[PDB]
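User: Predict the complex.
Assistant: Input components as received:
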Amino acid sequence: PIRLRELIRTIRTARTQAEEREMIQKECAAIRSSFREEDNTYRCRNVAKLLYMHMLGYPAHFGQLECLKLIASQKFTDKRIGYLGAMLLLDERQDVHLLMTNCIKNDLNHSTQFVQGLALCTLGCMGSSEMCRDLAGEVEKLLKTSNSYLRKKAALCAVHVIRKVPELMEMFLPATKNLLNEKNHGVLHTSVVLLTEMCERSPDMLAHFRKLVPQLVRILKNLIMSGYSPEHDVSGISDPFLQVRILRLLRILGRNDDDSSEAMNDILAQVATNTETSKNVGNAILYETVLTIMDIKSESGLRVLAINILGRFLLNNDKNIRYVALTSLLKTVQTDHNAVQRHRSTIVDCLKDLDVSIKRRAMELSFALVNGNNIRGMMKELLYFLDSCEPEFKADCASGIFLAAEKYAPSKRWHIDTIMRVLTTAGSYVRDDAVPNLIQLITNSVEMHAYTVQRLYKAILGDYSQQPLVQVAAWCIGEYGDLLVSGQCEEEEPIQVTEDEVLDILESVLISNMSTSVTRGYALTAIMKLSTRFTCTVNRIKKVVSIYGSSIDVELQQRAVEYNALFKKYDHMRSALLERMPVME
Amino acid sequence: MIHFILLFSRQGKLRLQKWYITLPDKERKKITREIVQIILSRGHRTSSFVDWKELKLVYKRYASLYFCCAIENQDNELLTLEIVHRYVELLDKYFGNVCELDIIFNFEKAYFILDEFIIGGEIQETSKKIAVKAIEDSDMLQ
Amino acid sequence: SASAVYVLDLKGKVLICRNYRGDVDMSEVEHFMPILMEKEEEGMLSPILAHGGVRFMWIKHNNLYLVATSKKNACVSLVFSFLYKVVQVFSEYFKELEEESIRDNFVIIYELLDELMDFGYPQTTDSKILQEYITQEAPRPPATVTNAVSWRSEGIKYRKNEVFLDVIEAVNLLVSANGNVLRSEIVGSIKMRVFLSGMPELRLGLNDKVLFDNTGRGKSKSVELEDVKFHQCVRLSRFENDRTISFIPPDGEFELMSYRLNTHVKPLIWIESVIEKHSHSRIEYMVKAKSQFKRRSTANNVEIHIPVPNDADSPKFKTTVGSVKWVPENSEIVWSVKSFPGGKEYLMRAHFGLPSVEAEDKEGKPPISVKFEIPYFTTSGIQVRYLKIIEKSGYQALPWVRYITQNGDYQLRTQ
Amino acid sequence: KGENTSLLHP
Amino acid sequence: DRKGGSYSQAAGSDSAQS
Amino acid sequence: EIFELKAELNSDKKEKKKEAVKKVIASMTVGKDVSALFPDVVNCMQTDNLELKKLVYLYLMNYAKSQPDMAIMAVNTFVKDCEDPNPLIRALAVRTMGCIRVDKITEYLCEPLRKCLKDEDPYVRKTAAVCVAKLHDINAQLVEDQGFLDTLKDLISDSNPMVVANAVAALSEIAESHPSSNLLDLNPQSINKLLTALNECTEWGQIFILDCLANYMPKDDREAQSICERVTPRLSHANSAVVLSAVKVLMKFMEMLSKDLDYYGTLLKKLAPPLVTLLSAEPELQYVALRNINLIVQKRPEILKHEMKVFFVKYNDPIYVKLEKLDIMIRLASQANIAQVLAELREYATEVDVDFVRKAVRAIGRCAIKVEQSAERCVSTLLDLIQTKVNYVVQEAIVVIKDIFRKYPNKYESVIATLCENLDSLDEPEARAAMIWIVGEYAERIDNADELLESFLEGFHDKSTQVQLQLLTAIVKLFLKKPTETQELVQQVLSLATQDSDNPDLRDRGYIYWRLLSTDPVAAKEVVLAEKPLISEETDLIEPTLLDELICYIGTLASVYHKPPSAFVE
């Protein structure tokens, strides 16, 4: 029975990874030998060593039955070790926690307050969809007890069961009724958390739970008045967790009702000015209150005070404070959007900040604050940010710019130009999923095709390694070859398009090694469609299709074979199925 | 609710871990490695807040060993920092000048304290002395 | 064409660096550790790294990886050869390869690094020759480096002229799980510890198949070595002309020749192993080892490594001869036999427990490896015929040689 | 070392 | 003695080959 | 600390000066920025003891670019040391002078280099030859002005084979950066002279002597025969690089040799034992040997045709060596050793490396595609692997079967029944698409093809573009072949891909299929269900122009990556 300290010292004495693995295996061999002997005296040391090895990165699959045996044991140390093992190496996907239900039920009625508490904590940490089904009856029995140390555990177990089984919330309504008078801070916090979870789960209990709003307001007022307390008072703030829970409950309650919002209006006003934000607890409480006010139909003065507080906090040099302010502004984007425009300079400056989270929050706020009048002005700033953006923020910036252009684009020509610029500058950052959206947007627009076709031809002849840009250019060519080149049936004056450069570009793209099999398919489809759309360069793509019909790709080979068959046997019927596809939203 | 809590050292070694989300062992290891790489590859002015996999991964290390949390996008961020500070203070008070050496050796006591303090990703006791008294009473049982 | 030869540590710290061309900034070593970690974590880890336009090609030593950055299209083989020569020199000078000597032998290490290679082109690599110009405890360089003979220092005098040879055999057998041997290669190794006076020109003579055919005696027992690799002292022209092995042996132990030919004979050891592994209940190891070698030969220190289950515990061994021990660090049954008479037959019956819970991931099938080492046994039949020791002064040499047979790549694939 | 130092130094 | 086979003296050249 | 060190270094006692030098060296090695004390150590430079002079020279070399201005106080010391009677001191001074990366210091170092160029000591000559190359790399114009090319050329034609090899290496390095103008090539007499000192050159000098012949282009068979005869002894060199250099030289010379003569056959026969010996080197050299074999395999595959056992990967072999072993076996795969290759692949499929398993599956598929005589054995092995119930193995087998069907599907109808129920729940895009394509093209031996496609049509609009296209193609093929049991299936597919399908290529394909169905269903049999021509397999052999260039670049960085030397250097 080696002690845990000795094993820790031995592990710390190992330097090489191979040496550490060898020592771990040597210890695990002895652990398995002791377990196979049914050891019950020094099993605690073996369990601790196995837990350390599993946390150190060693397998612990064989140590499953030993934990189950120790759980149903009588020694307090053995029971604690078994509970720790079940909490650590036991989960829903283990499939061995089904037998733990009987052990939990046996330990659920134990007279000892520690064994029952340990079992409840283990059940809450490793709750299963079936364990809660057979353990719901025992949870409710302990929920009606007057044990202050057990009330919080019962509330946590009920919350875990409700999260695992949302349909079991009906059995908790008659047990939590008349539980807002708890003197203990932990019991009150647990009750508030359970009520918030019940309200967020289903709205049927919102009406039933909305009658206790005056009680919650009175409790919050009493807590605010009782600013001095030995326990729960940290940094001059008493019951910061309780205050946060109360603020969250107030925000989640009465968000669409006037009586609920009006009842908590006085409390929100008192807390919005009677709180000290010198420490982080005060700032967190202020942020929670602001979020609750923004999430509820409060008074105009409360909104003005929240806006002033957010403006004051946005100038704070603390990175956490700035992130909280950005998150609050993003949350209060749709609500009070007019008042959010006053921080445009701050939002623009936040993009240049040296914080990745701060930069992301600023970018999200800028994207969410784009309106139908500031879109044109913000387009240049977005392009500049995308040009000098981080490698992981370039794709997100391009996606946000595309979404803003598709949502509140000032004009089709301006939106098309912005999309083309993003595609040309994004390069390998534009998502392939945005290609279908761009294709649909191009197909929907039927007024600007010659300029777009010319721009696509100009931007495709330069580079072809951009899979999204290449696919977009190929789709545009296939859809508007009749407009890209006009009167190019025979030799004519020297223009940008001569009816032969497009075919050469398509052939190069098809034969280029920088193809993912998606751009090649689009190029092949465009070439096939150009037989009817373009009549000047005829009888030339058929040879390429026949040569491309022996491609290694199964889909590409089948497409080439179909194209060759259509060109060699259905020449008159080729134009009978080359009509333009319908355009839909 | 706290999806997961992990205590890892600056060298990358993890001294504590407590995840409230049932995930595969390989998936959990990959997530832990990614979190360590992100935290280990972050500056001192990153705001101690990271949105990893749509999770408010908050990093706040008061010593060489850091602390991590996984809070869903439904609550305030300062609450997690306050809870972490309270847990650190309670651990220091229970242990008495808690250092890195005692964390590895006394991992069981830290796990028991965390279980008695936070259950299922949510808090269990707002006070700091009641939890200490309960932990002492549980330990004195033998 | 190495740009800078540097030595790292297990934590990524560069123990010692020696720039050779200076075309690469010294700050590129920082990204080597993250690049190696990324390559290893994705299965793309290789001894030749690449930090943009600079390649970090190096091998892993006992305690540190000797990574050498390069920028041009330098010869990777030349860099590997230089690294091997440096490792050999360090082993000759320092008995151990660990971090304890890097931080303690820097005074001589820097001098050795400066003298060995200049501008990325090494000039001297002989540890014995280099030991006369660079010492950790300086006169003019010896004429041996300037002279053609760079592996035999002149003026060496000894009380006696005794040279001990070592005909070391490496029995490598690749037996598939079907019971047939796929790769059966035996590589000869003639290592001699030359200790004589002066600069004798050894003229090694054996019963080679090619030599016997050329002389007309291609009817007796002759070793048909597919590949014969002479050392630096062995003259390539003499061996190419008429198979004449004439060279000056060095002062100390060195590798002169290394025969390498395929073997078409039956294995000296026949292992019949069975695996009666019940489904999560028990397992049986019906291992029977039959010695196909000659009865007059004894295999000293027979170590047949039998890979047992990784999660096996509470095992019982029912063997016949030899000590069988299961090592949890190695996770295998070590069939340790002290002396194995030729033709001996050892039968074993394994029995170990297994947990009810199945393993999360597969572990593979490690091959069974035998560590038999039977000296005074020449399976290839090659016998030394003569060793012409000629000295200008004139002395009566007393050459000696020993034949040792051991198991090389003698791994048996599992079923 | 840096490990024997207190987490908060209180 | 010595493990791995006792050392044996070697000849000088092929006396039977002149 | 710093003040105490400076005071110790500025003392008149050598016992403290040596300790200060050692401490400064340790601080720099320990990672301490001691470049600020460079002027202080400049005074304590001219010392009689060689132990402190070497440390000072090393510190100056490591602190030369950092403080080029403070390095102007060392030219006189170098000039004084370049004339010491001891050869070691002169060699150290020459090495340190060329290592100083100062633009204003190399100008005054031309005289010492010229003085040491004709030094009688071979070590001094080697040091001067190295310093000349270093200065030429630093400043080519200064080297050209100093006229060191003539002195370097005469170095090869003098005594001291080590010095000759060093001069040859320096000349090769200079010509490597040179624009090919005024090449240092020599006639056959120079080649013969270099070969004369090759047998006396050291291990490092052997590479330098053999690299010169890599640039020479022979013009006659007699000269090529003599070169091959002289390089033949190089195959018995203990150094791996020397053997590789000799092999590369022989390969380069074989471009002018005549296969009619017996010299080519002797060279081919004597090269296989060298490759076998190189294959048994260190694991680090295993990758280089495999790359060299792959490069030479595409040029002269008749040398290692009978060498198959040595290509088997060992149990303790590295991952980089295991991956190269599969490629070597595939390149050397033949019907003679088809059974051995299949057995090796079968054993390689029982490991745990996912990347190794995928590589083995790809190698097995390539071997099956290359040789049609073992198609049945490959199909049986793939069926056994699929029955093995391995997710990665199942995906690899599905991909291999899909590839084989498009190549040799004439007698592939006997395995469609086994693949009809083979755990189609796998969501791998490379396997689901292959299975869908096989079902669509091979929808004749399975009577429940329509039922199987029903399960794959649940999420066709959100599965993938390639997967959706493959499913649509399979549905169209089934409708064209059997339209009685798939009449409504075709309409449902058209509705889902034409109305609810927003993919541009997918939407176009759906519209084309609908138009073809509504125009002439009979013509769709000859248009869609047509006999495609033979699929042109992607040849793994490199281009002959690249192989010729890669042949000369043997053992370098361009050979391991199999890329041109100008496509990887920066």
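The interface with chain B takes residues 2-8, 10 of chain D (CB under 8 Å).
Let me know if you want any component modeled separately.
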